[PDB]
Amino acid sequence: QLTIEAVPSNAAEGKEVLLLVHNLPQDPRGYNWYKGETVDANRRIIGYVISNQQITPGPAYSNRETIYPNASLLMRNVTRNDTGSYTLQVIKLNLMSEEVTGQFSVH
Amino acid sequence: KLTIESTPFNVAEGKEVLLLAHNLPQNRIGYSWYKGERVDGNSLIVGYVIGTQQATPGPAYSGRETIYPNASLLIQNVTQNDTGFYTLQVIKSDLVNEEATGQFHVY
Numbered sequence: 239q240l241t242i243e244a245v246p247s248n249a250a251e252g253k254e255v256l257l258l259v260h261n262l263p264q265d266p267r268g269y270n271w272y273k274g275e276t277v278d279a280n281r282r283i284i285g286y287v288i289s290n291q292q293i294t295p296g297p298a299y300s301n302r303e304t305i306y307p308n309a310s311l312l313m314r315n316v317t318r319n320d321t322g323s324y325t326l327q328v329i330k331l332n333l334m335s336e337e338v339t340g341q342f343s344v345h
Numbered sequence: 346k347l348t349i350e351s352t353p354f355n356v357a358e359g360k361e362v363l364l365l366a367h368n369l370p371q372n373r374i375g376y377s378w379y380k381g382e383r384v385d386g387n388s389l390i391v392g393y394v395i396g397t398q399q400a401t402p403g404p405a406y407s408g409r410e411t412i413y414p415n416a417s418l419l420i421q422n423v424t425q426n427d428t429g430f431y432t433l434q435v436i437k438s439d440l441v442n443e444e445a446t447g448q449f450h451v452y
């Protein structure tokens with residue numbers, strides 16, 4: 239079961255949050271992270287293409303985010319305004335997909 | 346910008362509608378069509394790989410839909426439950442994916 243675990247779930251301003259991904263499907267082709275609860279190109283933060291290791295900053299990239307080969311997302315220098323949901327879409331080799339949404343708060 | 350045109354917009358019960366995708370990205374590799382306004386696995390009608398022409402139905406598949414290589418979706422023998430929004434995601438080789446939503450109305 240594809241899940242996101244926020245580490246930590248509630249963070250202090252200026253610190254970091256890692257959105258750790260568990261149970262990726264077999265045969266992923268790559269990943270995209272989105273701000274909010276829904277896949278939406280305008281809210282795309284960053285992605286990753288496995289075959290050529292291409293990293294793809296999106297319109298919601300804020301120069302604080304790193305995506306790891308295991309699909310996890312690191313956000314540095316978090317603020318109260320980052321509080322909310324984040325959505326991962328995994329594209330599989332056959333171009334079918336899975337989506338999962340997590341969240342964290344900053345105080 | 347990717348946009349969806351329904352033709353006709355007003356579709357009589359029992360007749361057919363064609364959803365056309367305008368301004369497809371050049372590096373497209375596949376498509377997914379969803380019922381409603383968002384990418385959502387529970388609403389996937391059909392996924393499609395351009396290169397193999399392989400269509401994969403999802404939970405919203407009715408047996409009345411046909412997806413074509415230019416992403417157009419024909420829906421036949423429409424019913425009142427078909428009415429509303431449809432959302433296309435175009436999967437690209439860099440996975441910088443694009444979405445567009447269209448609509449028709451059954452009468």
Ligand SMILES: [Cl-]
Binds near residue numbers: 352353361362363
């Ligand atoms: Cl027509």
